[PDB]
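Notes, p. 3: input format for complexes.
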Amino acid sequence: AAVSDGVFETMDAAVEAAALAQQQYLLCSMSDRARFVQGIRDVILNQDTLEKMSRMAVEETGMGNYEHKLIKNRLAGEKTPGIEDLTTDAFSGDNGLTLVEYSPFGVIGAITPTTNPTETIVCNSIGMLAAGNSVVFSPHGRARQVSLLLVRLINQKLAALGAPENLVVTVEKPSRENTLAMMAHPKVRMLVATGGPALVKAVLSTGKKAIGAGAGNPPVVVDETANIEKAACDIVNGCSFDNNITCTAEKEIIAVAQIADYLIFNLKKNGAYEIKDPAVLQQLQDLVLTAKGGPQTKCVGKSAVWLLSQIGISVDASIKIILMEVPREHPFVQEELMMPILPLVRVETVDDAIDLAIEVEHDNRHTAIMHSTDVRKLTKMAKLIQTTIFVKNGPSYAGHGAGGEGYSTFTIAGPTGEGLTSAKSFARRRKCVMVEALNIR
Amino acid sequence: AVSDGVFETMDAAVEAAALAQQQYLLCSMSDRARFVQGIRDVILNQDTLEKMSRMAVEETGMGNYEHKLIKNRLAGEKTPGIEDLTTDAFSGDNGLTLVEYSPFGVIGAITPTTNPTETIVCNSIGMLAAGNSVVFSPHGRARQVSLLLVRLINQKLAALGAPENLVVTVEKPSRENTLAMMAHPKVRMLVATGGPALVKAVLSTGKKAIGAGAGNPPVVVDETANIEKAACDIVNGCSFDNNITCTAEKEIIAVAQIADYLIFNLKKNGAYEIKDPAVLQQLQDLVLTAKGGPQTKCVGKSAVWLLSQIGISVDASIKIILMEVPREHPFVQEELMMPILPLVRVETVDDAIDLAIEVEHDNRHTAIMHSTDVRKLTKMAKLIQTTIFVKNGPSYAGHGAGGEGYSTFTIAGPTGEGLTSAKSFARRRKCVMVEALNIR
Amino acid sequence: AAVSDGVFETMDAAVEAAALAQQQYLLCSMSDRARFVQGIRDVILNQDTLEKMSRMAVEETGMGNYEHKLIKNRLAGEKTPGIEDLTTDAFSGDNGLTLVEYSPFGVIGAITPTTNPTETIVCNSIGMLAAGNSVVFSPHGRARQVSLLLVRLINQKLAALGAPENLVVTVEKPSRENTLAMMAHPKVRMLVATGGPALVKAVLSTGKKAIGAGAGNPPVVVDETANIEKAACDIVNGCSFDNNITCTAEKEIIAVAQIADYLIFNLKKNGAYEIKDPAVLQQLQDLVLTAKGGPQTKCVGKSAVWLLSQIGISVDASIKIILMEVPREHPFVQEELMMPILPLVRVETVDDAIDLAIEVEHDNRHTAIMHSTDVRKLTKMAKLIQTTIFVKNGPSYAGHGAGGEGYSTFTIAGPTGEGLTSAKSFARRRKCVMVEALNIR
Amino acid sequence: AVSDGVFETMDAAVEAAALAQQQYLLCSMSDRARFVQGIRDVILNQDTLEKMSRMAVEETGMGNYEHKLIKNRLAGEKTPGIEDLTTDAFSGDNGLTLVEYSPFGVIGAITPTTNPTETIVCNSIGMLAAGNSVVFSPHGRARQVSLLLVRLINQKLAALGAPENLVVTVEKPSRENTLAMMAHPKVRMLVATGGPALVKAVLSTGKKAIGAGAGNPPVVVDETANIEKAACDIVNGCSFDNNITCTAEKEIIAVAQIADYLIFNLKKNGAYEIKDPAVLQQLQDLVLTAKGGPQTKCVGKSAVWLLSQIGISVDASIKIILMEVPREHPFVQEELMMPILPLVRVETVDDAIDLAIEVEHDNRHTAIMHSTDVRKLTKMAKLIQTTIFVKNGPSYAGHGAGGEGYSTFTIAGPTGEGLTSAKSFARRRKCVMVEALNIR
Ligand SMILES: NC(=O)c1ccc[n+]([C@@H]2O[C@H](COP(=O)([O-])OP(=O)(O)OC[C@H]3O[C@@H](n4cnc5c(N)ncnc54)[C@H](OP(=O)(O)O)[C@@H]3O)[C@@H](O)[C@H]2O)c1
Ligand SMILES: NC(=O)c1ccc[n+]([C@@H]2O[C@H](COP(=O)([O-])OP(=O)(O)OC[C@H]3O[C@@H](n4cnc5c(N)ncnc54)[C@H](OP(=O)(O)O)[C@@H]3O)[C@@H](O)[C@H]2O)c1
Ligand SMILES: NC(=O)c1ccc[n+]([C@@H]2O[C@H](COP(=O)([O-])OP(=O)(O)OC[C@H]3O[C@@H](n4cnc5c(N)ncnc54)[C@H](OP(=O)(O)O)[C@@H]3O)[C@@H](O)[C@H]2O)c1
Ligand SMILES: [K+]
Ligand SMILES: [K+]
Ligand SMILES: [K+]
Ligand SMILES: [K+]
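Output follows (1762 residues plus NAP):
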């Protein structure tokens, strides 16, 4: 009588275990699904586990900050849709009744990132189990200890609820070699990749159904009609949240010249440290960029204080982002730093900002933000930029369900088109036609 | 001048469609509506309808003229338009949120020789309705009819002021062209309607892909069924377009107590029963290959024609060839796509369901059941987990011809989209207006 | 001085107090509504108050039993829809964006039944407050003490939650004369009536928007294809639930002759006491009927043990209903007894049973039940009888959400056509048209 | 032989509709679709369309022919058919639950002289779509045009194989006949499109009744609005059908900074501004009664007509009569239903919203606002709480002409149905299949 904890020595064993679990899960009720989904929430939302997970992940990856991981972890456990997300469509007429249902895929193989290692395990497992699947996690090696502990905790709770063993599994030695082994396993029916563009292309080359949640470079546009004070507060909060490691965070400002100066003034009131010295700006570049001009790993997810500390500047906790006005070609603008480093580009009109916001978004079709009260301008940018998420007059994280209407998720699929994934995304659509019967209108 | 939609190289076609898509983004929803209506008019024009139905059967040698008239009309009438692109909305204290269906870009579509014109009509309507351009990569066996339809569509759209090259294809449809479309960097989405090899290929391209694979639809008949009604439905669904629809019945699983009565009524409604094993081996030698798969020359041929090729002369009233064989028999396991319908006898309805899942080969495509017991209909529908499940009717009722719902000719099982429509070819986007527009 | 407890001396004072409160309620947020809705749930689902309410109702009215009010009150508190029932429809296109919302009516005047006194208040208040209304409750004289107590407990919880005073109010001495005043008070902008056919025609004659939950006479049809063992168990549970005082409970069996005997056999196994002596059946009629021929108020809602004991028959607690086979003309068939007395009419064919079920239903179009595994026959009866609720192969209370899919209500509108009332039913449909803006598809 | 739908007595019509509705229950949804379409063909037929529009203004003396063509066409094109009767479904461990829209029975509709043909066409399509029969009780003034429409409908329905008397009316429409219909026990639901007195009476008949009340729609223009676009939209919406449509603009509330520039642009789009109070006092004496309410002889007359009745000659370019009066002015406070548009100047947008609510008289019918500030647009929509709210467009954009959504000519403020359609004329029914058909 040895109950599994869900962590296996090899990827092949994890997949076979999750496959057998999926067959048994098919014999369960929707009520059973709901109890297991509620068990996952209970795990992450238990105040102790919540605090450990949040602190443990920041320590192991060095990315993010504790207080905001508490919020994001809670957001995942509280506002990830459950079985209620699996609605039913019905059409009744002379030819009978037709029902359309969301049924399970089978064994799903999920690949999680280093920025949100626990939040993405919580969100994926809740939605995938709600849809009747089993999930194999290939986590980032840099998030091994915390990712594996969370899996063990989930299995523990699920075992106490009488669930079939191994609904959620991972490997004891997370590595890229194991990810590839999962991507190649015949019994994996669907891949869900949350990471960079290189990962998204890989899973879309396996011969399997695959949801790809790629990267972005979210611009935020502030036009002359905007509540500048509010925009400044929303932009600093949105940019500095979790030290800018959320895929939706603001990562460049495109301000209309008429209001640019007053914006910068209010930015500095809300904790923005403006770098005006072109020599100090070069020190920051040397610190955060690599030879290839890309973000330096050791700096990703560090506070603005820490980053300024590294170049000999000492500031207090009130400073949340580092701010600089630079040309549109600057690397900080072009690159996805994932740091509380926020460039600002000055443009003449609101239409110029929209054009440059589309250009600098690099056609990721991911996220973009705009501050403005003119319904016409809000409509124009939203229509043109064609991003999976578009926030107006609020912090970027309002698109995640924290501050805006809608549920929350941590797998945002721009490329593959599924949008803000939920249990619906991890389900096959089925049609059931009862001919000339059950039409009782 | 103005493009007829056909190009010499695949790279030329994709580039043309890519620019048309950019131009298409400037058009209104009203423009999409007219262009969609234009495609309906092209195929619902009685003369073009008859020409396309006849020309398709002649070129591919598969199907029959009268039933192509029905399928082509279904694709043009019941394929959803821009009304399929609905808007979700949530409003509360944090303002308003909208969820919309937006364009994917340039879509490359591979279409089947069995339903060459129906798929082009169904695909393009939904794809252009979602704001996309489409590059079609037909198969060689249907080259002429597919190119004629593309040109006709480009004509009608040009008369409606549409950006040129919304629907394009190459002059020499070939396998190497398909592989080029699959690799071109401007193709944002692939849509494959065909066999398992095509669906796996398309899913190995590093692109978003919809895979509408093959099936082996079993029809289960239990002891609670209306036997003579089930006999008529089975024969109609099986022989429709000579069985080349991916959803048509292709093997019967009958409970033993009613099997003799089912066979009886099947013969009363156009089934030629084969009881002599000598003739059964003849039919196998004709329609099977050395490896054991369906013979391409026999696919899509009527029951009369097939029987003629083994010296049996019957009248037009015969629509299917029926035989009672074991479950391991080739006709059961293989997707013949012919009006040849093997029957397998089992003891109980539970054994029928178990065998129905096995014989479906995890294609998870289509299954049929005849039964009046609501508990048994529910059991089989839940367990077989196919994309379409039809109860107490012909298989084509799940296509929207005799059943509720819209119609499609690309049914995605592996990739899970179900019955593809305009929504299938769109990305979901979310628009959050923070703390405004909540007017409740 | 102190906050109102919700009870007022005159009806005018309560309508005025609710009119002011509803205006203050417009200044509240959807998040506030949710807390107020959750407050009502917390009140009735508080284990002590739950038992207290279930006990008081049965004692003060003499109808129902304690164990089953525990369930009905819990159902009303757990499965009544909240604010989430107020969806939003959107339409985007060339002409812009159209929203359709559910908005408040204002002050709602609600008349509750003596049979379901606490359950209707919980259900009505939740739905009406979720929609942004204030409710004036006009309970019947019998349920005075329990009604005022629930109203006082609601006002108490809402006050702690910071709500405006007097969102839920009633009068100190409920009476027919107070109900009439409420029905004619100008500031009352909607009437929701849960009761008999007289009350429904009254509110529909006041010159106000009125919802009318009428009476019924639910027949249960059993044909030859039905699982008879389960049918008997379900019919007994559904008929005896709360001693038959729920408006949806089975109140006459229409059995196909071929299975009528085996049905009666299993009914007896499941707690049915059959009366075969016509002299004994006569004693029951003299007890439960009036001179006019209607149900005796004294006997409404009493258990089967009680009713038998009052004609000199003692039985143990395993008896739940009194069964007798009678002609269709019998008064137990024609009358809505609201007692655990269940007649059985034998017919030849299932088409005969369907024809008779329609007749006996008396065009109430309220509730009906059928037991059958034939999909053709289930459809036939459902289409033809055209009732607001139709239940198949289960106890009648599955239409209430207790054993069936959907939410729960205790105000089922047949005449006015709103169906299973919820928050939507107490809200006005509004259209907002943004011309040529916010069409960001 | 076949009835034409017109009956001498009310009891005969209601009895005929009752019998018709019984026979209607046996018809398929396909039949309803056909009957619904048949009504669309009746009014969209160009000859009838022009006949009805012309015959209506001539008989009633209200509105004008050009705009009745648009409204009648709107009623026939954009009134939802049977597709409005959607089905909700919930499936789980406890089985399947369907929610359907079923018929009420016999509906008694009361149509206004303002929109006599439009209301009949809209109500009949929706009521027949839901599966009901309708007994129309027109007003005396529109008798001839109403009865001609009913007769054309019964003719076309009779050709389509419909049960006789799905749509009926009486030969001599009167108030006694309206009261008879209200009391008849076989009338299951009453639908009232008219003034407040009608709504109260119909809600006192002991029946289910939808009441479409009156409105006094204000239009708020604030300093963030496109003044040129606003001036053009206001004149067009106010003058449309000479202001008889219940949703049309009937008073302007303008913020002070833009009031003069708004008046300036209103005149450039067809507004004759009155500044001589002596002339205003003439208009008051013409278009009002001794009591102070609208004069029935002036309702629905063009601005050119109303101006000539006080010795002022203008050409067909003048569409409305403009004047800036204080809040208490009769024009402002009364639902004139004439192209007479008063303006009230206010200091801030907040003052305008407060006055807009005040002047709307709690009818909660219609309100319009011109602004680009998403925050201020939201504030007025949230607070005024009207059934229809239009932002940055002419009022009639709420009827579906110029805005998103379907069209209706019965707008229920008091009873809360909103923009009525086939759904509004149906009962909600729940069907519960316990522990079966849960096939997910
Ligand atoms: N749209 C969203 O929902 C979302 C959410 C969060 C983050 N992101 C984005 O993802 C990135 C987050 O950081 P990250 O470093 O953890 O992402 P990552 O660099 O792509 O790595 C994630 C996983 O992908 C593996 N991987 C990468 N390329 C692979 C390939 N060709 N073949 C097989 N496996 C491959 C990685 O192995 P290795 O360990 O060797 O790299 C790792 O296991 C950011 O770009 C962020 O914008 C997106
Ligand atoms: N799920 C759906 O929605 C759906 C719909 C329709 C069909 N299907 C499935 O599509 C499949 C239809 O098969 P399909 O053949 O039309 O498309 P396909 O199987 O995917 O591809 C067949 C093509 O390969 C070549 N080919 C096949 N056999 C050949 C042979 N003996 N010799 C030379 N070339 C050969 C031909 O191309 P060349 O022109 O180059 O010779 C032929 O057109 C069925 O399995 C059907 O069930 C699915
Ligand atoms: N569709 C639904 O949702 C629904 C729900 C529940 C009930 N119903 C139907 O409502 C009816 C039950 O309603 P109800 O019982 O609460 O009220 P009721 O039966 O309509 O009448 C009882 C109330 O009215 C007075 N009354 C009438 N007859 C009386 C009598 N013989 N003796 C003393 N008082 C009498 C009493 O008022 P005083 O207290 O002032 O004496 C009593 O409280 C049933 O017909 C039921 O089918 C429908
Ligand atoms: K950047
Ligand atoms: K086969
Ligand atoms: K009864
Ligand atoms: K006015």
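Residues 1-216+404-440 of chain B form a domain with the Aldehyde Dehydrogenase; Chain A, domain 1 fold (CATH 3.40.605.10).
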